[PDB]
Amino acid sequence: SQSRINNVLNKIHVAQPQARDDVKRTPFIPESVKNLKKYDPEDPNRRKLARDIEAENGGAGVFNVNLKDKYLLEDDEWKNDIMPEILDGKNVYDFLDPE
Amino acid sequence: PQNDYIERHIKQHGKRLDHEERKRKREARESHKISERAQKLTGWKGKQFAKKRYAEKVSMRKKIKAHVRGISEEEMFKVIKTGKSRSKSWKRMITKHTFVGEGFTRRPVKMERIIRPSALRQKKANVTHPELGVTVFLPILAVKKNPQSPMYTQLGVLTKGTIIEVNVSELGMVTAGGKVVWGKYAQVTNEPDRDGCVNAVLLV
Amino acid sequence: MGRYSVKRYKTKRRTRDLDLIYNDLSTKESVQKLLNQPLDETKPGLGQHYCIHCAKYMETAIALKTHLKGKVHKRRVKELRGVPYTQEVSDAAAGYNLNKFLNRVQEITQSVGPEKESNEALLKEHLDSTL
Amino acid sequence: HRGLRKVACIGAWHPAHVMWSVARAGQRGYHSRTSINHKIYRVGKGDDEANGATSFDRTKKTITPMGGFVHYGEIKNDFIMVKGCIPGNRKRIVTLRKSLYTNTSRKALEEVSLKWIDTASKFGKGRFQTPAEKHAFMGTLKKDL
Amino acid sequence: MQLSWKDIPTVAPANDLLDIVLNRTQRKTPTVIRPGFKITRIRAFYMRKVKYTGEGFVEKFEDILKGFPNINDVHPFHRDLMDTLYEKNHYKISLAAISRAKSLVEQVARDYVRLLKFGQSLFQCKQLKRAALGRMATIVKKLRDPLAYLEQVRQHIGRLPSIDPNTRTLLICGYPNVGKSSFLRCITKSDVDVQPYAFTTKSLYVGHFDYKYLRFQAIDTPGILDRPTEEMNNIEMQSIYAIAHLRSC
Amino acid sequence: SHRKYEAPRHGHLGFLPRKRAASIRARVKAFPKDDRSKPVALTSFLGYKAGMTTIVRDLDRPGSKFHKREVVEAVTVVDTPPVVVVGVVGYVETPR
Amino acid sequence: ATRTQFENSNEIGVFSKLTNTYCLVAVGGSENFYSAFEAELGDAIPIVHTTIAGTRIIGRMTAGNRRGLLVPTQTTDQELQHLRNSLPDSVKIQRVEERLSALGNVICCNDYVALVHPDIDRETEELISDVLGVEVFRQTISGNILVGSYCSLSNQGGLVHPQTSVQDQEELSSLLQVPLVAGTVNRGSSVVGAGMVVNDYLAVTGLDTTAPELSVIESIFRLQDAQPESISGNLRDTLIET
Amino acid sequence: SGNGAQGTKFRISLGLPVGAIMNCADNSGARNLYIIAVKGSGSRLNRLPAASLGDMVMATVKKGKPELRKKVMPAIVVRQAKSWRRRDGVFLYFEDNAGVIANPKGEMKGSAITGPVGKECADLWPRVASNSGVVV
Amino acid sequence: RIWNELYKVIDSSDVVIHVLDARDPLGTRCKSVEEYMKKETPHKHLIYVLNKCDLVPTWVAAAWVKHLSKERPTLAFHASITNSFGKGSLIQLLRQFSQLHTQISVGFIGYPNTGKSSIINTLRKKKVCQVAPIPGETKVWQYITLMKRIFLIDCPGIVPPSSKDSEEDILFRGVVRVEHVTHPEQYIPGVLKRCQVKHLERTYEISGWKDATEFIEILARKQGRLLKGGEPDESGVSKQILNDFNRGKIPWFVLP
RNA sequence: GCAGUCAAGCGUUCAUAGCGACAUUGCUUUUUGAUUCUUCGAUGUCGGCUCUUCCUAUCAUACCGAAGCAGAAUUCGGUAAGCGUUGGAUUGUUCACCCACUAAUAGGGAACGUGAGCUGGGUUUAGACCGUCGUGAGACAGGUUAGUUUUACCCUACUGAU
RNA sequence: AAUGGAUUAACGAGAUUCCCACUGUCCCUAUCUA
């Protein structure tokens, strides 16, 4: 062809960085991921995978995910409490701060 | 897909478990359902069932054997009331079929009285022959004898019993001396109002 | 609701508004774009002779001479003197984001103010030299 | 001719009687009706102060809007807050039956959680919730000092 | 279109196809008129049934001539499997018979509406309706033999495998009873019988596999005996154009 | 002729005759039947309708596109004082 | 590389956000799309159901990396509080107000170097370099104005849309310091940023993604532990046919 | 809903009936669109098929490039200027009518979208939301 | 009905003249009609007439009658009354057929806007027929008499129902009333091909034009016909050009 | 349709004095899907806005049946009228035919439903022109334009009210 | 072809077609006064 292969060459010819710095930049893999097992589909001992936590109490349109009970507070005793979000006038999220 | 696949699926899996029970219990019941459809099916479903049931008894018994009326003038003439105020009952239109001739060239509308329309002009006619039993589609050349008046001879009304002069060029018949015959006389046998065909028996 | 106010203030027939027009004068780059638009077929003065204060195209260069010498165009000059009334002025009136409000008023007094007045001075320097 | 707010052709030539289904003019309204599947949100108490305060608001206010309801006074009794719109008008007697059959949809099973109840005045384009807000926002007035 | 032919609905035999269309114009159209009516209503009643039945035969015929894969200019491979298997002469003659049979229905419908406008009574307009339906039934009863052929080539053309000649294939050719079916069963997912007799596969069987992130298809052959090299069995002739046309190893 | 454009009927034939009622208190036509194992429980109640108001609500509904979102909606408020009992009535089933 | 489909849509980057240290998914209907991330990522990093302005399209309203996270103006205070409770205290969260709200279509980034929309303001060009800690460059990919949709990145490598010129890749690879390939995803869809999500060790794309299309994505993003991107030259014979 | 539109579509006010000229929001080259019919519409005597925000309509082009004029093509409406109801307690409306044009699969023809895109339209159609520079 | 009146006047007449446009007779005339005349009515004569010949120059209209003389006699004619061309000639031509028939109906067949009902007005030399530059004039034919022998009949104009022959030259012939085009601006590059550079610049006289989308606005700013708001009306200027193409206010002609 | 052919039956008893179902052959413009661009005198007035009801000979939706029915789709066929059958483009026009949507754009009746509901668009006076015929008054093969029928308070019916 | 024909500026409570502007004619009805 020799008129169409330069279109295909736009995919094949990779790019090169030309290395343009002093600063070194490295990828980041957190070591909890490296230490983690690989999920196996059929296994006597595997993790629950909340697909399956969903199915055992109702189907897909009737199970109710608590968006809470999965987040990090300094005390888990108040993980279910309620932000007031309004007092008399002038809603709360404009007033709260550190100190 | 991927050539014939059901008959391979018959071999390697079987039809069903009760496929030989259900099929055998079909024609055990079909002796009772033929008498059931003939007593039901009210209104034209009992007509076409009886036409196909009677066509089966004929087809099975063959295997055992193996081993001019008068035409009024109030019809074929239409009162054409012309003008703005529809009171001019003068003009007439032929409502039956007509051979018009080869070179015709219509007269003016102010001058004419009798109207031969465009759609009812059969030029060619089915010419059946009693000897050799062959129907040939031949053109008409002239209208010699018309019954019920000598007046419709000049007009050309082609109802029934009208003797027309039909050419014979494709047949190529041989005469005495053998010059060749190119024309005959044929008599029409059906009203062309009922169908656009004009059937004419060539007189032998 | 009424008869006259519906004719001019529908959603279809809305003008630009006072908020954006103060932004167009405030810098020297957007002034030179609007004074030098590329000519367009779907615009009344064929994309020339555009007033920046009144968001309005004029038919002819004669129709800028008679438009600037009028009480209609001396509204919009007097209208655009001060702080352009954003949303932030209305929130500061209820006791809400003063420091967001007062810092913008601090910048219009210091920086954005005399940059605008040195642009409106050059428009009268230019529209008198060409007309 | 003869008007435009009407049915034009009221009948054909047979039968020679206006039939019972051709929409003539007459009484509108003041019929009895039955509307089913209305869902209770809130059952407050008369002795309970701060009925209108939910778990979010925490502002001690009653469900009575400012200056009361329109053509109806104050609430100070038990009440039922049921969604949608009950047939009838204000200061009229309604009767509340219960459900006639076991309902099947998931909409009959939801545990509602109110987040805010409006109490701005219905006698105008009301903006304020409590009469302490209106004095907070306006500032003091001439008849005050 | 290309690569597959499954989208042809049906065709009935002439005893059934005449039974459908004439039943269709009895149920749809109105059916009751009286002799005391105006002549314009009686004439325009039978004008409706001639044209509506006339379109009824054509809309079935337009479902035949559009569906069948138009054997000239498909591809010289798909033309030439159908040459050996379906016999191009009988294929092209029968479809051209229906195209002749379609145009004659248009001629009879356009005449017997045009002749019917001068019927001066009920006893004349009825006869033009019956002669318009009869001369259409003559075309159908005459077409009884080409319809039964086209039904059986419709049931076989859906079950042909889907191949593309421009795609990369590979042909597996050799003698009968060698192992070329058993080779195909282990190389790819396909239901091809492995019975130990000579001519098991009578048609081209295709299976798909993947090498180096691509799509390959493996076309099986029936296996051949060359003996006179000019004339050969139609089962065996399917191999030769699979070798000639298909541009792959 | 045959009406040339089919269209639905204007108005519902079920709620006829459209006429003024017999009393301002609408009568109850039928009650939930009887489950004769349950405790004693009243089946209806009567109160006075008074006005409307708005309600926001965090919609906890599985499957919807407004799952875990907020929804404004309008409710009625029916004034409901306590209601005092003064009588008992018994009914004998006849074949009428 | 994993094929996964939101309810029946192959578009993944519209509906999900994936960084090195956290993942963000929508709340649509059932938790089949949610568990398909936990099959690959697991307990290690927080995968958070959230909405942005009550919408499902959260992969195009936010933009962030393993340091910081940016949410637009229309994000309610509840959806802003809900994100902070879920994520640990390393990741910065800041509501950004701008003219334009689609932060996903506008800010394409890795942990190190980000590109922005050209008409973006100078005030947030400060804010992106502060929160994300990255170098900001004002650039178009072959003259397309939305850099978040037609260009995907990670610290490993990046993928651009196939209308990009040969000259424009090498000019732009000097800025990002990563290898780049004009690629297609989900059978020739040019929108490569919304088509897939990717971090430095995982890629999730649609079911419409074909087997040659996984070959480039696995290679240019260096996903396995024995793929140094040099084997994309050994995959040339696949790409000649495609 | 129909093809391409993921999810369901709630009831909003019908702003654009048949024969309503609206602006064109992409860089394809059309200036105004001209609606001829609305897909997913009802059927009632004497009504007009009315469009809304986030619908697909068949629309012609009156002003634009001569390659684009005189052919019907689908289009998705992104701005309305008739006040509708978000389900949190606010009504809102835009300045003008606008629509982008697309294939029946729902995939965009242009590369960018000028002006703000509606929120209900951006949820229903993913390929619009990839090309939307501004949401709401 | 437009074919029902055609098959009435073909059957009636003896000599059918056929008017052909001198601008372009080969795209004008008919295709199914002349083939029909030899097969079912062979005894009829079917002569051609080239009218509107003052619109075309001298040597070109003399070249059209010579090329067509090999099949039909093909008179050359101009259709007006106060200054005619060929008035005594076609009168003398009809004295030759009626002498062979020693009444004779003569119908005027033709293509629309080619001048059937203006040639009767110069044969009768009075205002018999309705003439107007819009195409759709008559619904019915009318008997028009002279010599006591020759009867003039004017059918309405006939468009052969071919798909091509063109999609867009149907506007370039006087067939469609050009008020009813949905988009007339696309046909403006069509009339640049027909009309030369000098002929279009001898009438509007402005300047040199390129890129016909520009040429319309060159005219629309000079005519001063513009929408409210300073906007050049692309429709109302393109309509006037496509009329002046058909009415003959611009000189265009296909070369022989 | 005509002209044959074949023959279970019919003809006072009856093959062959003579009829003839069920089948079938005669061509009815060319055996290789090329096209046929052919609309051939509807002599006559209803059509449409609003609105209701009724048949089934069912176009959709409910449930079955049968076919090379792998699925997907799609056809034939039955029971069924509960419910639903549209928006536009050219002539007074129905007649005749497209464009798009739709699950589907099914067929009919009720004085060819419906003028003391509307419409006067068209149907039918007197004014006027052009064309044909007539010496003429005038009529038309015909075309164009202009143009008065206007209750209800009566008994019944129906929707509401004592 | 003074049974008068072709042409044409200006003028017209004359006959017909379209384009901008515009709007409850219409989608689809609501409300106020005498």
Ligand SMILES: Nc1nc2c(ncn2[C@@H]2O[C@H](COP(=O)(O)OP(=O)(O)OP(=O)(O)O)[C@@H](O)[C@H]2O)c(=O)[nH]1
């Ligand atoms: N300059 C010039 N104009 C002509 C000539 N002949 C005809 N025309 C113009 O062309 C227009 C159309 O002529 P018509 O008599 O209406 O032709 P038609 O459409 O067949 O007429 P009908 O038969 O009644 O339908 C006339 O109005 C004349 O103005 C000519 O010879 N020269």
Ligand SMILES: [Mg+2]
């Ligand atoms: Mg073997």
Ligand SMILES: [Mg+2]
């Ligand atoms: Mg003309």
